[PDB]
Amino acid sequence: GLVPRGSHMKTLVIASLSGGQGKTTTAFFLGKLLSQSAKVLFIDADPQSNLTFFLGHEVEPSAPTLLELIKDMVEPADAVYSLANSNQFLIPSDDGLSNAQEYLASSGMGAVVLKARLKPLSEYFDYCIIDSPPARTQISIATIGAADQLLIPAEASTKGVNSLIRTLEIVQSLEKLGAFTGSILGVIPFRDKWFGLSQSKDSAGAIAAMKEVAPQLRIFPSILESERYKQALNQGILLSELGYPDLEKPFEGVKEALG
Known part of the structure; x- marks a missing residue:
């Protein structure tokens, strides 16, 4: 079972409304960094x-996951699984999670269903980290x-800049309808190309344009373009442990802004 503390769980959502390895990479590394001294629900x-x-969890055949939780077929705790780390838990996903689509649409209140489904777990974790669909x-x-x-x-x-623009309007519209009651922590640019001492004019330009579009948002130091992220992911470890701590700095920076 789950040992309930006196905590009030802070839900942090990694959302970009476009594809790419950025959300998953950020959720993974950020979730692990947070778990160093706090209880984390992925x-x-x-x-x-x-x-x-990448977290090393494999869903057993008839096991309840995020789908069962969303469709209210099971207690929220019944969809929580512990991982190797004693501070990390997971509400996993698999194949037919996209069947939540219809269920959520046809409910008239999809944008607050998950929020409601998670409230029972508030007291058991310090942070909840959500990796959202692309x-x-x-x-x-x-x-x-x-x-x-x-976190965007x-x-x-x-393409990343236009994606940011679409995402901000979706959030803005969810705010007006009372679904989104949080705040935007900031934007973390990824796939930022450098050629050693000098950065790609294209990357530089795009990041510069991100400040123009969202002048009120914090733009975090970027996630460099690097095959190392995927290498650490494949082995289920931190970048510092893999031996590349510098690549881990932009995630540390987000952790800092959370405390």
Whole structure:
């Protein structure tokens, strides 16, 4: 079972309404860093289920997951699984999580369903980290609804900037309807190309344009373009442990802004 403390769980949602390895990468490393001295609940709200894979969890055949939780087929704790780390837990996802789409649409209140489904767990964790689907979908909107704090990864490219723009309007509209009651923690640009001492004019331009579009948002130091992220992910370890601590700094920076 779950040992309940006196905590009030802060839900942090990694949402970019476009594809790329950024959300999953950020959820994974950020969740692990937070767990160093706090109890962390991971939620893999992506039907690809990469976060579940990279955390080393495999869903057993008839086991209840995020889908059962969303559709209210099970107590919220029955969908929580412990991981190797004593401070990390997971509401996993697998194949037919996209069946939550219809359920959420047809409820008339999809954007607050997940928020409601998670309240029973508030007292058991310090942080909840949600990896959201890489498009605008009912599930994606529900993850945003659930947020106390929203972190927007954005590719350091023209496509990344437009993606950020779409995402901010979706949030703005969820705010007006009373679904989104959190705040935007900031933007973390990723796939920022450097050629040693000098950065790509394209990356530089895109990040510069991100400040123009959202002048009120914090733009975090970027996640460099690097194959190391995927290498650490594949082995289920931190970048510092893999032996590349510098690559871990932008996640540390987000952790800092959370305390």
